[PDB]
């Protein structure tokens, strides 16, 4: 499991405020490099990273039409949504598109993606086998059918495997310096000796990349969850990231709980304590 | 390159 090209899309039906806000975001690992925010002066595809900027006019243009077109197809979807739900014409909503490909170091994608979400819940998604859909709610059921006969997956599958994998290695091969740069976390626990007879150890993990990580605590070997506390992986801005997990402990056990840090940059899973 | 809703709606 190594690299990916993930494209994030959001259609936001803002009733009365005009046509839904449409936006596309391009990703490789945890890096936004391209964007398309409907509400813009020059509505071209934006180079949201310097490395991609090497791409010619043929690219940005060949992409603008891509986005702009999709915006229209979404408009339809949004409109059609209400119908499928008897919902008020004056109600706002969101249609989310998440399509990408997780390609392995050698070169073969480990997984292709093409999924949907209306507002927040999963709507319909192209399964693991890359050849079949999934219907969350009854609405999606219509779609699975619609898409089955039309052979919608076939058209997609060849992208995730095609231009996705094909453009992935290129986006990397021409901007790998800027990209790749893997960083390990520099963890360490803190010990707040607050009153109430209970002290809490906080295990931070900083300066890492990729963002994707895993962090935990182990009390004398015992795994613990319904007691732990972990903040979302917040970005450090400087290409790096931060994060942490905390566990309350009775003032006097301390040596009994230990934090774990697993990350690509790390050789073995980092175990520590206070 | 990004994917495209191939005008294959809901």
């Amino acid at each position: 499991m190594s690299h990916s090209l993930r494209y994030f899309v959001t259609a936001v039906s803002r009733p009365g405020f005009g046509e839904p806000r449409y936006m596309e975001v391009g990703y490789v690992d945890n890096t936004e490099f391209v964007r398309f925010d409907s509400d813009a002066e020059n509505p071209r595809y934006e180079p949201r990273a310097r490395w991609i900027e090497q791409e010619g006019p043929e690219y940005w243009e060949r992409e603008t039409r891509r986005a702009n077109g999709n915006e229209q197809s979404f408009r339809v979807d949004l409109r059609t949504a209400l119908r499928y739900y008897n919902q008020s014409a004056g109600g706002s909503h969101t249609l989310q598109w998440m399509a990408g490909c997780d390609v392995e170091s050698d070169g073969r994608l480990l997984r292709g993606y093409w999924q949907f979400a209306y507002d927040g819940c999963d709507y319909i998604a192209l399964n693991e086998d890359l050849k079949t859909w999934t219907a969350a709610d009854m609405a999606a059921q219509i779609t699975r059918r619609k898409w089955e006969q039309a052979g919608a997956a076939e058209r997609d599958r060849a992208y995730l495997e095609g231009e996705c994998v094909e453009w992935l290695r290129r986006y990397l091969k021409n901007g790998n310096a800027t990209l790749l740069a893997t960083d390990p976390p520099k963890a360490h626990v803190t010990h707040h000796r607050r009153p109430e007879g209970d002290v809490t150890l906080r295990c931070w993990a900083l300066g890492f990349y990729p963002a994707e990580i895993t962090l935990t605590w182990q009390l004398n070997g015992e795994e613990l969850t319904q007691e732990m506390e972990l903040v979302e992986t917040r970005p450090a801005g400087d290409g790096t990231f931060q994060k942490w997990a905390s566990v309350v402990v009775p003032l006097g056990k301390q040596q009994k709980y230990t934090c774990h840090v697993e990350h690509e940059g790390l050789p073995e899973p980092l175990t520590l304590r206070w | 390159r990004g994917p495209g809703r191939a005008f294959v709606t809901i």
Binding site: F8, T10, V12, M23, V25, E32, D37, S92, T94, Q96, M98, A117, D119, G120, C121, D122, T190, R202, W204, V231, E232, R234, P235, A236, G237, D238, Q242, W244 | -
Partner: protein, 99 residues
Amino acid sequence: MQKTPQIQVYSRHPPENGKPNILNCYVTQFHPPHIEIQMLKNGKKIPKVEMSDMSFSKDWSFYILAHTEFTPTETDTYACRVKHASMAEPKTVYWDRDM
């Protein structure tokens, strides 16, 4: 559904009184995509509220990050007020280096 935003008011660089910096208000785990983020310095609002991001996680859960250039001191109090649908009132979150 309608999920609650998990705010985090931290700094882009380890805090040093006098040493300039960046204050991030990385907001996450929230839905719908509408939200309002204000970076406040001593109660008042921060003019150049440089904000950035606007995307979402695997579980669809939206995310965005605000960030103003600032400088710590012992006194100057900084916080980040987030107003969002999932909540009844704008939750304000103060800056706390010591963690």
